[PDB]
Design a binder for this molecule. Structure first.
Ligand SMILES: Cc1cc2nc3c(=O)[nH]c(=O)nc-3n(C[C@H](O)[C@H](O)[C@H](O)COP(=O)(O)O)c2cc1C
Ligand code: SF4
Ligand code: SF4
Ligand code: SF4
Ligand code: FES
Ligand code: FES
Ligand SMILES: [K+]
Lengths: 431, 263, 87, 42, 213
């Protein structure tokens, strides 16, 4: 098979207007191959479309990586009299992550067609696009694209002349990173506090308005038109087995050229930073640690970054995760403890407060981490902090609690001498 | 007919479909720890005190909200189950105020009693605690809201049983506060029942304040006469004096509630 | 919510006068059975104990809570009134 | 040309741009489903 | 940041608020987006609309939204206090929102924050005497590659330096609307110094389309 990955050609790139050089409206999108033979895809039927996504190996780009074809297939069942909906998760809240922002404002028609193609495969009557309220301009672009699609007959009654009725609604959030969680997002669309639901029931059974629903990331939805047009097998020819396809990467932090780029899955982490982002500030040897998939994923030290591949399975072996593939790079001038402490402060500001371990636990960790920044603590508290995070992890309603425990575990796992060295320093200045 | 078979600590029990893990355990005489769950309110699943291990399953489930599945073995005394309870109790007590001597709930507090039975015997919380301001909701219910553990029992009772949507939560995170947001009285004819369901001393009886402790009261089972419903009550007396009125469960009359006039 | 004090049968006697001690105001009693409470495993055991001791007794059936149908998903009903407006 | 930015329309967006667009889109939408009652409180 | 309402002369249930006739037409469109019998789904967009009309949400505005949609006022208060974009107190004409989460912290968002403070002379969480600016810190705004960035109302200003933000503020005082987007050479999220990708003309319709349609 293929042993090395990366160096993707522009012909095999999906989001061919990532940087907004070409016109983002309907005229430009059609010139780039969007909305092509969409009618034919729709008449192939939900089974064929679901087969395309199953064969492609697509996994959720929202941060959990569930195989999309299997996930979307939960909706492929006879109707119960209730309407069925597709919700596109464009809350884009994970710190370090800003890839769905580009799709919404520069390639809006791929998403709109993605809603129709993905919507048809689920037998959904409409798509609700939830977008964070801060992306006001981006949500305004998406409405122009939706209006153009309505006026060109692409969506709505008898969409694309296919006989299928489909609507696309845009819904703006009001400032809440928790509303990117799939059940918290559904609650917000219903006009409630963004508080996740317990499972079961699953959204495919009881979802938005109590109806069968599927929540899919913007990136996941926006690629399904091309997976069907160009074929699932073409998509599966990228990346390692069970880590298929291309992927949008955000490289931010201490890199020379922070950027958003599209690359092949399983590209080496070192290659990704150096080729596209202009390398680490001060050179590679200045690298201290990297968070490879947004704030939730645990950091990794320079040694692990030497060879680690950027995909779901490889990063699991490195005791982290691909997440949203937002690479936050920290150089040796960083205060690693303070950097993570600011991340725990983020999760403390974002916990919905619903359930006990995160409502009280995350705030507890924030106070301990703040003290660890100054070394105003004892080494025995480090293992206490490790135990506290394990009590949060796996005991909460949603995965935000896990996402607030993993960064703490990553810091303790790789930088314990830094913590114990700060406590020792603080102690001597206070004698 | 349609009963499915589950196991509680290896003991087989037959239950209807839709029975929760928590209900399956009751059929063998075990009571799962709880705070947010109440059998007469809608399921919430937020306190996480009912987490229990399912055999050969990596993740603990909320016993109050999880339907059982055929063949499940519910390990209600496992090391994983016991350590889940200890962690949750620890988070509940982190910001809780050291109030038991001045708190009316003392001696009949589910937080005290489940800390004794299912919690650790000491604290490792080395920070300062949260402090919340108090809220006036009328002359019958006193609110010491720093004791609130955010179980939302009062909110669900106010909405579902009294049919009043006045109580809610404001803010979020550790700062989420139960209350009415605005200055408002909760004066339903059934309002006094939020004193009983509240598991802590956050909502207490103003008329009863400070007068007695639970262990020293003698309980007479009696009948209310303020209406023709015939609500079953417990009269609490002490040294020849009536101290308070409590509901007495009767499924076919008052369930477990009473009116404010009765109370 | 604990139900561990509802497991056994109890026998208690009728309440009689308690009055205020003139000196200190304490509650005085002339009833030797005021504090006598007996625990029994079953209703039959309690009745047999009362028969052989000559006491007139009233027995009250045990009240067991009814089994409830609980469903977390009912909170989000498409068309029923059980749908909640807050969590 | 691949040398110029072509997303400058939002430079002249305003307070009501998004809701004006939502209002104009209303004519193309399908009739909504109904749950059978005016609300869960009916 | 208190989550309890205390009546004041300027913020009480009798404070005058009402949607304009035009905003009532917009509200009709919002409500039509959701299934019949689920008007409560409109609570967030209608509250946001009232904020856009009024600039912030007095208790009367929340009570108006509840009345329109037939939802208890408490369920509107919960939404108003849960979501951080709702302003339950008046804010300056320009709400400056500086991201300070770690990716922007690594790109020196502190220098940006101090530059705004030094210029306007207000600490974080305050409003200028003339009531033109309100300064706060916010969590990740989803523009991390273009860090450090700020958001003023609905616009993003990105790749900032202390010099750049002072230039923007000067324009706002002058009344001009500054251009959203990066203040460095680049336009959006591309790598600086040249594209490492998408340097070829995008392919056209029906390219690589699989046989069988
Ligand atoms: C706290 C939290 C925040 C999340 N934020 C987002 C988000 O902003 N965008 C997103 O696509 N998924 C987000 N997710 C993941 C969703 O819960 C869900 O897994 C995803 O939308 C599923 O879509 P997908 O399978 O196509 O990836 C978040 C999850 C959690 C726990
Ligand atoms: S883990 Fe945190 S964010 Fe998730 S439901 Fe519990 S309190 Fe809310
Ligand atoms: S509610 Fe219970 S644990 Fe809390 S102070 Fe009162 S008696 Fe003590
Ligand atoms: S006041 Fe009592 S019943 Fe209400 S949420 Fe707090 S602890 Fe629960
Ligand atoms: S009793 Fe189950 S989570 Fe509260
Ligand atoms: S960390 Fe500032 S925009 Fe993401
Ligand atoms: K109580």
């Amino acid at each position: 098979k293929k042993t090395s990955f990366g160096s993707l050609k522009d012909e095999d790139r999906i989001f061919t207007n990532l940087y907004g050089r070409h016109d983002w409206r309907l005229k430009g999108a059609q010139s780039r191959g969007d909305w092509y033979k969409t009618k034919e895809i729709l008449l192939k039927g939900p089974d064929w479309i679901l087969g395309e996504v199953k064969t492609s190996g697509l996994r959720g780009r929202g941060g959990a990586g569930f195989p999309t074809g299997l996930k979307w297939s939960f909706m492929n069942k006879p109707s119960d009299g209730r309407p069925k909906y597709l919700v596109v998760n464009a809350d884009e809240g994970e710190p370090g992550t800003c890839k769905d922002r580009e799709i919404i404002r520069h390639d809006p028609h791929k998403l709109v067609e993605g809603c129709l193609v993905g919507g048809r495969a689920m037998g959904a009557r409409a798509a609700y696009i939830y977008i964070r309220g801060e992306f006001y301009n981006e949500a305004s672009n998406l409405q122009v694209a939706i209006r153009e699609a309505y006026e060109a007959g692409l969506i709505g009654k008898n969409a694309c002349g296919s006989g299928y009725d489909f609507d696309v609604f845009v819904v703006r959030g009001a400032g809440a990173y928790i509303c990117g969680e799939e059940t918290a997002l559904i609650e917000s669309i219903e006009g409630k506090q963004g508080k996740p639901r317990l499972k079961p029931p699953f959204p495919a059974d009881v979802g938005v308005f109590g109806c069968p629903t599927t929540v899919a990331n913007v990136e996941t939805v926006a690629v399904s038109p091309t997976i069907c047009r160009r074929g699932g097998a073409w998509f599966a020819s990228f990346g390692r087995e069970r880590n298929s396809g291309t992927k949008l990467f955000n490289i931010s932090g201490h890199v020379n050229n922070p950027c958003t780029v599209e690359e092949e899955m399983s590209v080496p982490l070192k290659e990704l930073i150096e080729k596209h982002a202009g390398g680490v500030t001060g050179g590679w040897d200045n690298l201290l640690a990297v968070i490879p998939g947004g704030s939730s994923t645990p950091l990794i030290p320079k040694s692990v970054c030497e060879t680690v591949l950027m995909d779901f399975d490889a990063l699991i072996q490195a005791q982290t995760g691909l997440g949203t593939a937002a690479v936050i790079v920290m150089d040796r001038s960083t205060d690693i403890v303070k950097a993570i402490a600011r991340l725990i402060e983020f999760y403390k500001h974002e916990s919905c407060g619903q359930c006990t371990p995160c409502r009280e636990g995350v705030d507890w960790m924030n106070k301990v981490m703040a003290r660890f920044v100054r070394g105003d603590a004892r080494p025995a508290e480090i293992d206490s902090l490790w135990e506290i995070s394990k009590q949060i992890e796996g005991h909460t309603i949603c995965a935000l609690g896990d996402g607030a425990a993993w960064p703490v575990q990553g810091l303790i796992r790789h930088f314990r001498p830094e913590l114990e060295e700060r406590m020792q320093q603080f102690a001597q200045q206070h004698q | 007919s349609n009963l499915i078979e589950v196991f509680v600590d290896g003991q087989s029990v037959m239950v209807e479909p839709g029975t929760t893990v928590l209900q399956a355990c009751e059929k063998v005489g075990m009571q799962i720890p709880r705070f947010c769950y109440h059998e007469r309110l809608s399921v919430a699943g937020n306190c996480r005190m009912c987490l229990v291990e399912i055999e050969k399953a990596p993740k603990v489930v909320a016993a109050c909200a999880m339907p059982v599945m055929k063949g499940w073995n519910i390990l209600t005394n496992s090391e994983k189950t016991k350590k889940a309870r200890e962690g949750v109790m620890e988070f509940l007590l982190a910001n809780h105020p050291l109030d038991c001597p001045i708190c009316d709930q003392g001696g009949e507090c589910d937080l005290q009693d489940q800390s004794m039975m299912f919690g650790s015997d000491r604290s490792r919380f080395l920070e300062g605690k949260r402090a919340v301001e108090d809220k006036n909701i009328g002359p019958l219910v006193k609110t010491i809201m720093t004791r609130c553990i955010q179980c939302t029992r009062c909110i669900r009772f106010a909405s579902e049983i009294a049919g009043v949507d006045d109580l809610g939560t404001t803010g979020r995170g550790n700062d989420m506060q139960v209350g009415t947001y605005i200055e408002k009285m909760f004066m339903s004819e059934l309002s006094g029942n939020i004193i009983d369901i509240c598991p802590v001393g956050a909502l207490t009886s103003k008329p009863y304040a400070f007068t007695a402790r639970p262990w020293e009261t003698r309980k007479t089972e009696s009948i209310d006469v303020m209406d023709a419903v015939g609500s079953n009550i417990v009269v609490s007396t002490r040294t020849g004096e009536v101290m308070r009125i409590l509901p007495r469960m009767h499924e076919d009359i008052n369930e477990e509630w009473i009116s404010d006039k009765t109370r | 919510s604990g139900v561990n004090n509802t497991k056994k049968w109890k026998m208690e006697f009728d309440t009689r006068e308690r009055w205020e001690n003139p000196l200190m105001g304490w509650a005085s009693t002339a009833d030797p059975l005021s504090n006598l409470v007996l625990t029994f495993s079953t209703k039959e055991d309690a009745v047999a104990f009362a028969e052989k001791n000559g006491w007139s007794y009233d027995v009250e059936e045990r009240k067991v809570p009814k089994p409830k149908s609980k469903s977390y998903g009912a909170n989000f009903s498409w068309n029923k009134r059980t749908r909640v407006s807050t969590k | 040309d691949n040398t110029t930015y072509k997303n400058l329309q939002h430079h002249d967006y305003s307070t009501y741009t998004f809701l004006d667009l939502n209002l104009d889109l209303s004519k193309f939408r399908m009739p909504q489903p109904s749950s059978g009652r005016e609300s869960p409180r009916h | 940041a208190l989550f309890v309402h205390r009546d004041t002369p300027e913020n009480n249930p009798e404070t005058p608020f009402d949607f304009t006739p035009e905003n009532y037409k917009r509200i009709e469109a919002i409500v039509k987006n959701y299934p019949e019998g689920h008007k409560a789904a409109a609570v967030l967009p209608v509250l946001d609309l009232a904020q856009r009309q009024n600039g912030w949400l007095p208790i009367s505005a929340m009570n108006k939204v509840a009345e329109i949609l037939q939802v208890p006022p408490m369920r509107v208060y919960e939404v108003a206090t849960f979501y951080t974009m709702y302003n339950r107190k008046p804010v300056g004409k320009y709400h400056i929102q500086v991201c300070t989460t770690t990716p922007c912290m690594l790109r020196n968002s502190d220098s940006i924050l101090e530059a705004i403070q030094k210029k306007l002379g207000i600490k974080v969480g305050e409003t200028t005497p003339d009531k033109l600016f309100t300064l706060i810190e916010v969590e990740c705004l989803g523009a991390c590659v273009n860090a450090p960035m700020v958001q003023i109302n609905d616009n993003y200003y990105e790749d900032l330096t202390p010099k750049d933000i002072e230039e923007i503020i000067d324009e706002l005082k002058a009344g001009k609307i500054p251009k959203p987007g990066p203040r460095s050479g680049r336009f959006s999220c591309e790598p600086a110094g040249g594209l490492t990708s998408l340097t070829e003309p995008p392919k056209g319709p029906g390219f690589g389309v699989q046989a069988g349609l």
